[PDB]
Design an enzyme around this catalytic site. Sequence first.
Site, short mmCIF file in Angstrom:
data_model
loop_
_atom_site.label_atom_id
_atom_site.label_comp_id
_atom_site.label_asym_id
_atom_site.label_seq_id
_atom_site.Cartn_x
_atom_site.Cartn_y
_atom_site.Cartn_z
N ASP A 15 0.77 -1.08 -0.05
CA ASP A 15 0.06 -0.27 -0.12
C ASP A 15 0.78 1.28 -0.01
OD1 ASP A 15 0.91 0.12 2.56
OD2 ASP A 15 -1.04 -0.40 3.40
N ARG A 29 0.98 6.86 0.08
CA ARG A 29 0.20 5.67 1.11
C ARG A 29 -1.27 5.79 0.56
NH1 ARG A 29 -2.81 2.63 3.37
NH2 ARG A 29 -2.50 1.66 5.50
N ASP A 34 -5.67 -1.12 3.90
CA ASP A 34 -4.49 -1.49 4.68
C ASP A 34 -4.13 -2.96 4.20
OD1 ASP A 34 -2.81 -1.35 6.69
OD2 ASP A 34 -3.96 -2.57 8.17
N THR A 35 -3.02 -3.06 3.59
CA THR A 35 -2.27 -4.21 3.28
C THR A 35 -1.74 -4.92 4.54
OG1 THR A 35 -0.68 -2.96 2.34
CG2 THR A 35 -2.05 -3.81 0.74
N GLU A 37 1.58 -6.19 6.51
CA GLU A 37 3.16 -6.02 6.27
C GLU A 37 3.86 -7.11 5.57
OE1 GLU A 37 4.21 -2.65 7.10
OE2 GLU A 37 2.40 -2.05 7.77
N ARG A 75 3.93 11.26 4.02
CA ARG A 75 3.35 10.44 2.60
C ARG A 75 2.13 11.06 2.16
NH1 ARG A 75 2.88 4.53 5.47
NH2 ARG A 75 1.44 5.83 6.40
#
Length: 129
Positions: A15, A29, A34-35, A37, A75
């Site tokens: 992401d 971002r 939300d991917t 980690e 970001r």
Amino acid sequence: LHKEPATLIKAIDGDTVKAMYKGQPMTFRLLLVDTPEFNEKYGPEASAFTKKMVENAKKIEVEFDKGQRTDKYGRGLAYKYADGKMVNEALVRQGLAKVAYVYKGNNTHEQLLRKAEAQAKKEKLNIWS
Ligand SMILES: Cc1cn([C@H]2C[C@H](OP(=O)(O)O)[C@@H](COP(=O)(O)O)O2)c(=O)[nH]c1=O
Ligand SMILES: [Ca+2]
């Protein structure tokens, strides 16, 4: 919202993508997702999915929402498009990201992405398997 030009510098993970925007490097971002980690389950798969999408595109574009354009880390917060297809939506539709970080005033594409997530969940894809 308006799509603006960017040039890929480096895919970072599921992401986050580094890209040249108005001639300056910016780490983007992805809004509303939300991917995992890289160290987490489906993390490498999300990273690879986004990497292939942005690397294979003839062009990438970024689309800011109406609210915050930068987060507290500096970001860029955007919707990212690879040859007109939204990366944020594609990740969710494939069960490689959850809809997340949905803040009022920066949530134009929330319902699009929720609809994708419901479809991924029904198909039991990836994170929903
Ligand atoms: C997607 C998004 C993340 N963020 C911030 C909230 C989280 O702060 P915290 O780091 O204190 O947990 C962090 C999650 O980003 P990552 O999922 O990349 O770690 O980024 C925003 O502020 N606005 C956004 O729209
Ligand atoms: Ca993440």
